[PDB]
Ligand binder design. Sequence first.
Ligand SMILES: Nc1ncnc2c1ncn2[C@@H]1O[C@H](COP(=O)(O)OP(=O)(O)O)[C@@H](O)[C@H]1O
Ligand SMILES: Nc1ncnc2c1ncn2[C@@H]1O[C@H](COP(=O)(O)OP(=O)(O)O)[C@@H](O)[C@H]1O
Ligand SMILES: COCCCCCNC(=O)CCNC(=O)[C@H](O)C(C)(C)COP(=O)(O)O
Ligand SMILES: COCCCCCNC(=O)CCNC(=O)[C@H](O)C(C)(C)COP(=O)(O)O
Ligand SMILES: [Mg+2]
Ligand SMILES: [Mg+2]
Lengths: 269, 269
Amino acid sequence: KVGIDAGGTLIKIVQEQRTFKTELTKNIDQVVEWLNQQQIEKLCLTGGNAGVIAENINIPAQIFVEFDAASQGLGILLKEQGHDLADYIFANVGTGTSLHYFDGQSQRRVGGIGTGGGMIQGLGYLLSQITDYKQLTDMAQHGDRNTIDLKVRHIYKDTEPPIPGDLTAANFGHVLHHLDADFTPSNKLAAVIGVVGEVVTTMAITVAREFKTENIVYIGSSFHNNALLRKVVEDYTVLRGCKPYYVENGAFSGAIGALYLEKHHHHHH
Amino acid sequence: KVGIDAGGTLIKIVQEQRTFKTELTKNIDQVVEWLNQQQIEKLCLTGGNAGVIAENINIPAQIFVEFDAASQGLGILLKEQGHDLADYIFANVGTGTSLHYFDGQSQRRVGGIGTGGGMIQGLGYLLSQITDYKQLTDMAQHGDRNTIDLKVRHIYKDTEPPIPGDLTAANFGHVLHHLDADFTPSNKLAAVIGVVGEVVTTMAITVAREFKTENIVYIGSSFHNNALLRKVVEDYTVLRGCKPYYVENGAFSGAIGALYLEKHHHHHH
Ligand SMILES: Nc1ncnc2c1ncn2[C@@H]1O[C@H](COP(=O)(O)OP(=O)(O)O)[C@@H](O)[C@H]1O
Ligand SMILES: Nc1ncnc2c1ncn2[C@@H]1O[C@H](COP(=O)(O)OP(=O)(O)O)[C@@H](O)[C@H]1O
Ligand SMILES: COCCCCCNC(=O)CCNC(=O)[C@H](O)C(C)(C)COP(=O)(O)O
Ligand SMILES: COCCCCCNC(=O)CCNC(=O)[C@H](O)C(C)(C)COP(=O)(O)O
Ligand SMILES: [Mg+2]
Ligand SMILES: [Mg+2]
């Protein structure tokens, strides 16, 4: 069997040892072409575009809701990778961002936000005219956010501030103080990644506090080829007294979960 | 006496009936010029740039921390305007955004984020080259976000989604699906206001849930001349089962609070 998580931007495919593959959601027809060349008895599907695959191929399919599939696959990966966490927030930073509290037994969605990988690509395109994901993310890595973002220390100056001075006070809030600066593509893109990372993290640490867990597990393809994003998120998570976890193949959590859920759907009473 | 909240972008001045005035923080020297033409016995100061005013003029001054000054002024304005709220979140959407829980007696800061008025101006400048605040905000009001923002309904298509289809899934996440669109200045600016409003609101409703209040009071100068921002925030607050409140002269809460705190600082035992 095959597990497929057909998301808003990427289609994640898991073949069973696991073989991992991705395809762009825009190229969903090419996934169907690939499937038609395999010897597959059943599709285990999840994600927003699961229905599009199912209706376009004659292989029997079963669909699972992404939140439960992602939680189940993530729980499997965490254990494989040596983590025995009692509870955690997980933040699925996909095309958009979905936040979940896992209490040790099951997941509940506790929030979400439109700041995620889609914004990185879209706002990154508006600021740089780069459409290629590897080019965009590579360009951002070494950007300097200092002429773009305002820190608390910039507002309070010689007065000791009421919250730590190094914190971002206003994303893009320094632009009007640097109107003669060279706002390079790298610098602008670093600031896009900065705001996305800071928003995701802020929401994750807030729901971590609300649900009384110190653990925050970050998954999603948005971290791929984006070490800057991983650092923005890791650093701020630690600053706010929580423990960040990244997961090898975590972006395939849903696909793994779909396979697992299909397998255990069979029972009787 | 005079109350002055010298913030990151605007200096809010209250003279006592109240007279309200603003000046750009960049023009802080002109506030000092104005002060030197008045007959003022004492300055009641708050905000990040309070120290700059105090060190540049010979009028006796007392400084108050903005969070307590804002809370106190807001509590005064709410009562003046007929609201007797038992508790509430207040979201101070200034150059950046600071979030507070007021339990009926005092405030505590419960979060914050760099998505606020500074981002509107800075990212708005990067996308439109407009520096004038009235021009920028006026241009945004009637922008169409539909080719820029991705909704849940766009990902899930003919499948009923696990969360409501009209929700923003990814700010700027539709850009790559509309690469031949005319991304007009109005449309781009509406999307900037959209992401700021949605992030602020998301954080406000999350801490409202955490601290068990249905009331969210929004203050800050970021709402001035920005009906779109007010609508984005109001609508999403209501959708998430909370009650939004806007306050006449709410952006002057800190200045009013500074005057009040100075007046009642005098006591003995
Ligand atoms: N090869 C790639 N092409 C396009 N986007 C990519 C790629 N690798 C990583 N990404 C990033 O990952 C995001 C998608 O994350 P993912 O978790 O797969 O979301 P979804 O389930 O919505 O498809 C993209 O918006 C982009 O930021
Ligand atoms: N006349 C104006 N000039 C510049 N910005 C304005 C003006 N009116 C409203 N704003 C908006 O209000 C924001 C500042 O809000 P405010 O609550 O005064 O913050 P601060 O206390 O940091 O100065 C600006 O970033 C901008 O979005
Ligand atoms: C009108 O909209 C007001 C603001 C809504 C803000 C909150 N938005 C959300 O919670 C949706 C965020 N996005 C997500 O949760 C995900 O992108 C999903 C829609 C679940 C789709 O999953 P994926 O394709 O993996 O990103
Ligand atoms: C390194 O930074 C990591 C991310 C930090 C994100 C959180 N940032 C914050 O909480 C600061 C948000 N901004 C604010 O609270 C306000 O702008 C203040 C700094 C209090 C200044 O007040 P004002 O001038 O009125 O906006
Ligand atoms: Mg996904
Ligand atoms: Mg302020």
